[PDB]
Amino acid sequence: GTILIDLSPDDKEFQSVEEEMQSTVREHRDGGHAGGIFNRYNILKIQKVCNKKLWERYTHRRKEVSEENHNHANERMLFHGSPFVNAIIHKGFDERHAYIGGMFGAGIYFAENSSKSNQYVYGIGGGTGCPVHKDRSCYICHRQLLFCRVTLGKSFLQFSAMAHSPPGHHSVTGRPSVNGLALAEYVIYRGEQAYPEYLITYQIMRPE
Ligand SMILES: O=c1[nH]c2sccc2c2ccccc12
Numbered sequence: 001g002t003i004l005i006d007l008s009p010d011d012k013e014f015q016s017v018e019e020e021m022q023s024t025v026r027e028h029r030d031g032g033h034a035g036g037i038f039n040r041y042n043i044l045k046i047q048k049v050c051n052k053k054l055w056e057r058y059t060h061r062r063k064e065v066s067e068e069n070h071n072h073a074n075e076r077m078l079f080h081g082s083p084f085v086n087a088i089i090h091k092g093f094d095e096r097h098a099y100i101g102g103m104f105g106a107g108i109y110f111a112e113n114s115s116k117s118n119q120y121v122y123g124i125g126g127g128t129g130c131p132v133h134k135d136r137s138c139y140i141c142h143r144q145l146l147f148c149r150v151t152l153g154k155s156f157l158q159f160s161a162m163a164h165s166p167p168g169h170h171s172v173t174g175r176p177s178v179n180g181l182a183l184a185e186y187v188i189y190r191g192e193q194a195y196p197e198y199l200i201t202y203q204i205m206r207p208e
Pocket residue numbers: 079080081082098099109110111116117118120124185
């Protein structure tokens with residue numbers, strides 16, 4: 001039921017999605033090990049993901065969270081990188097996209113920093129890098145990230161350096177407490193609390 005609509009680079013929606021992608025790049029404490037060395041991306045394509053059933057699944061759950069949290073969905077747009085982005089756009093998020101070894105438990109992880117999600121495109125810790133060259137820092141191969149609408153609801157705040165949400169909460173917020181430049185990361189425990197709105201195809205760019 002999924003169709004992908006290609007956005008024109010002249011569309012304001014293309015532009016605002018690209019800007020969120022580029023502006024949320026940061027340096028990482030692994031010196032680029034997982035995700036490569038780059039300060040910015042070459043955005044190749046931005047597609048709107050359209051699936052009525054997956055959307056209504058999202059909005060149904062959003063209303064439930066909202067009504068449990070004084071009419072506040074606490075909805076964000078967050079990045080998600082994963083080897084399984086193609087399963088995700090067709091079938092939605094579910095238990096199989098949970099990070100079992102994650103620091104906030106076995107849920108589905110999202111990032112404010114596009115560059116954080118980039119580290120997961122080829123697997124946990126970047127896996128063995130790109131299929132074709134085995135290069136975690138490949139500048140040639142095309143990568144994809146999802147920019148997702150996520151319902152956080154009442155989020156459990158965890159300061160720091162499929163399971164269930166903490167009792168009385170709808171998500172976990174991993175608040176960075178050491179690296180002053182890191183943005184927040186988030187975990188939901190229900191696949192229906194995220195909708196993969198944009199598929200972004202890109203390459204990381206070698207600095208000069
Ligand atoms: O964007 C992310 N994708 C994936 S896939 C398995 C774990 C994660 C992950 C963890 C922390 C922050 C972002 C992400």
